[PDB]
Amino acid sequence: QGTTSSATTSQTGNTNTAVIDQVGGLNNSAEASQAGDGNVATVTQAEGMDNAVYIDQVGLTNTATVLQEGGLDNDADVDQDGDLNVAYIWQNLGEDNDADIDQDGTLNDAAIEQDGGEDNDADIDQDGSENAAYVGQTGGEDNDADIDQDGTFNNAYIGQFGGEDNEADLDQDGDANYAAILQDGGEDNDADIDQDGTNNWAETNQIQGNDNDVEVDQDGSDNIAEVWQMHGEDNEANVDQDGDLNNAYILQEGGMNNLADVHQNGVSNTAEIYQYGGMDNEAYLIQDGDMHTGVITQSGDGANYAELNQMGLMNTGSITQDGMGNSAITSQGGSMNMSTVTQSGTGNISLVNQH
Amino acid sequence: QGTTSSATTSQTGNTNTAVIDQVGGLNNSAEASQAGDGNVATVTQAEGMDNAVYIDQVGLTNTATVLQEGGLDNDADVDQDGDLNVAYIWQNLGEDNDADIDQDGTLNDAAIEQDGGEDNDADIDQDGSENAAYVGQTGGEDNDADIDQDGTFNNAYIGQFGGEDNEADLDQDGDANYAAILQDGGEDNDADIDQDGTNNWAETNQIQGNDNDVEVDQDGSDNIAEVWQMHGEDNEANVDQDGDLNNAYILQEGGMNNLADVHQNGVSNTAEIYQYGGMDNEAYLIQDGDMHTGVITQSGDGANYAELNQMGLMNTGSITQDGMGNSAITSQGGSMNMSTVTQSGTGNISLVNQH
Amino acid sequence: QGTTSSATTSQTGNTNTAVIDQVGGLNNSAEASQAGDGNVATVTQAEGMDNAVYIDQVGLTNTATVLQEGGLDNDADVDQDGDLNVAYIWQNLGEDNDADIDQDGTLNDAAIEQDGGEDNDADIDQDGSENAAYVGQTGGEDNDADIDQDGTFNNAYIGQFGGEDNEADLDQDGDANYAAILQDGGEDNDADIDQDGTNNWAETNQIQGNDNDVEVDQDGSDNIAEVWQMHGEDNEANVDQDGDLNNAYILQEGGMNNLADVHQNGVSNTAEIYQYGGMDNEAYLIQDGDMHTGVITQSGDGANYAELNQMGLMNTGSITQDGMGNSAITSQGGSMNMSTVTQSGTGNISLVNQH
């Protein structure tokens, strides 16, 4: 009942399975090429017009499934080179959506889901063994998601529910690294996660924010980073962890032009930053050494500046600012230093040095 | 110089001519009976023993010629009822050869030639106007040729050059139908052509094949069917065309138990099947609609299955299989669908659905 | 490089400035609390162990500076309530030194300096406007200095250079009163100054004396009292002035158990007492009236008794005693009486009555 549909299957090898089901639609194109043994390719295009699906499998027992239900000019591309790679692509009711999966290696699992939307771009590139990647885009226009995993046992999750021009970039290199990016609504949100090493945990969330920027960089082992930005405009969060067992938490609820920066070098350092609204609030938490604990809390409108630097072992620091223009700088050197700063009002200046 | 020859002439009517010339031979029998006006009968038996010739003409200006040169127990029978019918029988150096011509109507031309061989049976039955039939048997034992034409301007050709137990059956009903059967060598080859309608062209060729079966069935106008089977054992070819301007071509070169099936309903449908060797290769090409183009090619040893179904207008399909056990099923529905499937190797499974 | 230092800043209001600098040291504690507008707090702890600094400012533009360089268990406390109050505390190389400043009012200036020593206690309490107080303690053990000023333009100075268990007490109530206490060496020296009124001048000096007691009490306007005790043990000086323009001078150079008493009531009375060594020398100078002039001089070992009483206007009296056990009693009544007594030797008894 559909006019001008095109389907091509090319199989070289032993026990290769290719299934193409084009039910309805005008000028749908499906191509499945399998070189090797035991490769499985499934393509299902339903009610879509000018939809393009391309699957290219090389190796042993590679599995690829593409399901495009409706939509105009949807493009899906799967390229598997290796053994036991699993790829899944779903595109429902989207216009001009582009999905790309490129897996090289063994036992790689990649999934891309695009439910509606226009001009949504999803790209997954996995190299190595047993890497798991998921990209989900529900609604929205011009949303870009990119995942790049190299190594073993790496878990990557990217979710974009609504919004225009939201960009998510995930890069993992190493073993057993977990990275998660969530963007629920908002325009021009940029999230970037970069993990190098073993067993690193990174999570970023941007809810209903415009022009929010989150950057997480982890190098080493067992580093945990969590970033939340809710209902804020032009908020910037930066996390940099080098070493082992470092824990960083950043929360920015509302506000415009709020900047949070966490820098940790060493083992078992804990940093927490909380910003509740306000304009031009700046928080810096630097911990060089082992077993550092730092807490920064800001609530107020206008140019609140907090800096907490801890060098050495087991230094404890707490800074709380409430009001306008409060400036607090705490620098701890040595072992077992404890600092507590509480500022309320306008124009408070506090300098704490604990050598 | 020959002992016990018998010749009988019985003519009733005006200007009937009967000539019997028995030169040499023992116990040759010739009988010519002509009832009507202007009938011409010629019998010439030379050097044959126990040869029997019978001519029976009824009507106006019927012409019959029988020439038996040598041979043992050769039997020729001509029965013409009508006007201007022409019958020719030639039997050279054959033993126990039986030739039968039965023409009823006007301007019918029938020719039977048997050069050598033992127990060869040729039968021509024409009813109608201006039908042309030719049967030729050169050598071979127990070869059976049968032609049955009813209607106007029908052309039938049957040729059997060598081989044992080869059976050719030709049936034409209608106007201006052309049918040709050729069997060059081989044992137990069966060819059957059945044409109903106007201006149908059918040609079947079996060269040096054993137990080959060809069946062609055409109903309608301007249908063209061509079947070639060369050097194959137990190969089966089936062509079924219903409608107008349908073109079917089947080629089977070598192989054992290869099956080709073409089914066309409609106007201007084109189907081509090529099988090059192999065992248990199966090809099915079904075209329901108008202006369909289908091509199936199989090369490989073992259970290659190809199915190409096209429903509607101007659907184009190509299936190519090389190797062992390849299975391809393509189903096109709608208008202007294009499908291309290429399989190489062992165990390839391809399913193409273009609705 | 220092372990376990603690610093706390709490600012409520507008344009408050708090600076805490802890360079080196073990377990140093600094706290700065500022409620109000424009308050300035500076704390600097260097190389000290277990040093405690507390600053509490309430009001407008209060200034407090504390500098503790080294020492063990040094405690500094500043409490300002009001506007434009200035407080300065310096503690250098002292152990267990306690400094307390409490200013309530406007434009009060208080300074405490403790250079070395163990268990030195300094306390300043100012209530009012533009009062200036200074306490200095250089060396010594268990030295106690207390200043209490109430009113306007009051100047208080306390100095203790060396010595053990030296006690200085200064009390001023009124306007433009100047009081000075100096203790250079000696053990168990007690100095007490009490001024009530306007423009009163009091100065007490104790140099290298043990168990010396000085008491000055001034009530009224423009009263001048000067007391000097040098190199004496158990010497007692008492000055009591009531009225206007009264001048009292007491000098005690050496000696044991020497007693000097000056009592003046009225306007423009002049009293001078000189004691040069000796044991149990007693001098009494009483002037009730206006424009009295009295001079008492004692030089000798043992129970020298001098009494000069002047009642009325412009009475002039001079008593000179040289030797042992001289007793002189002069009583002047009336106007313009002149008395001159000179005793030399042992056991001289003089009685002068000028009615």
Author numbering:
A (entry chain B), B (entry chain A), C (entry chain C): 1 to 355
From the paper:
As a representative structure of CS-class CsgA monomers we discuss the AF2 model of A0A0E3UX01 (pLDDT=93.68), which has 15 curlin repeats and an additional half repeat at the C-terminus (hereafter referred to as R15.5). AF2 predicts a highly regular (the average main chain RMSD between consecutive repeats is 0.18 ± 0.02 Å), left-handed β-solenoid with a negligible twist (average main chain RMSD of top 5 AF2 models: 0.48 ± 0.38 Å). A transversal, on-axis view provides further insight into the structural nature of the steric zipper, which comprises a central hydrophobic core composed of the Ψ1 and Ψ2 residues in motif a and b, flanked on either side by a glutamine (Gln), followed by an asparagine (Asn), forming the pseudo centrosymmetric core predicted based on motif a and b sequence features. However, R15.5 has an uneven number of strands (i.e., 31), resulting in a motif a overhang both at N and C-termini. Rather, a proper match of two motif a overhangs across a dimer interface would require a fiber consisting of consecutive head-head—tail–tail interactions, or head-to-tail interactions with a twofold screw, i.e., 180° rotation of consecutive subunits along the fiber long axis. Disulfide formation of Cys residues introduced across the R15.5 interface occurred in accordance with a 21 screw axis, and also de novo prediction by AF2 showed a head-to-tail 21 screw in the subunit-subunit interface. For this we selected R15.5 due to its high Asp and Glu content (20%; pI = 2.98) leading us to hypothesize that R15.5 protofibrils would be less prone to tangle up because of repulsive electrostatics. The R15.5 side-view is nearly identical to the side-view of E. coli curli, suggesting that ex vivo curli and in vitro R15.5 fibrils are structurally equivalent at the fold level and essentially in agreement with AF2 predictions. The docking of an R15.5 AF2 model shows good agreement between the experimental cryoEM volume and the predicted β-solenoidal architecture. The reported Refine3D volume therefore represents a map that is longitudinally averaged over the curlin repeats.
